[PDB]
Amino acid sequence: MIKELEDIFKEAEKDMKKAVEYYKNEIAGLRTSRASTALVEEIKVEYYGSKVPIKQLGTISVPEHNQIVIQVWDQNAVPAIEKAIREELNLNPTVQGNVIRVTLPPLTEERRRELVRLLHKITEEARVRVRNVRREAKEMIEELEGISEDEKKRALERLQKLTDKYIDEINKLMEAKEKEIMSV
Template structure:
């Protein structure tokens, strides 16, 4: 029984780290990356879809993204979606492709982004700790209901704590890497 609780907790922690990894990848650093557009959703064919589902995104140089829609009628919709996003980028369109120039970031903007990364990191740590708390409560309930022994309960809680430490460390490593990437000139 405790093994299932631990396995469930580990799966949920993995998901929390993966969500954080995707969120951090989409944050603008000092160079162009298709991941910048992951959260941009385009109104196409009656539903909202990610940009990469309706276009090819290329990086011809470190400061430029080129978006080539598969259906040219979507070019205006993609442009509107980028303008409506919180990226702060101005798309230019030549009727065939949309170009996004990534301006160099100021020192002030870099520091703001590092604060955002730190805030998101703390949110993920809290999420992982909440998963730990839930798992420990389930284990303690099993112990209270005499479904597991006190020793087994203690072992299971120790295992959950090891998982928590492992995934919080992973989140911290992702944060450190992103901060380094943002602060590089």
């Protein structure tokens, strides 16, 4: 049927979708002490007045796990990436000839604590959004005519199906990361 439910789904979807998308965005690009090509991925380099990643400019690969190597085939993207990488990686990258070798201080006992605690706040923030989604969406049903059984029932499952998505989506992100974060 076509009732207030549609508004609940649309509101619940846009709210959860944006929350998980941005949430994963923080974990996918966080400042991981590990020499991973992922954290970055958006090494926006200036090319004659054009901002583009190093997808068709050079190539980045991990040689010893605790190292990141960026190779800018062109001399034009060498200067930009240097400033770009240092911005996101927040480290001192070395450039020789036409290759860039980046090594970050061994993520020791304390180092692991930095990322883990940083993700730790992220995970808690995600749940806060999800709760509000079900709590907010529910308010819409209870607001309609003050009581909606047909709506509340269909709206709850709809809200639950979406909520569970974030539940499995969030825990899945941390579970994987733990294997990497605690890998050391």
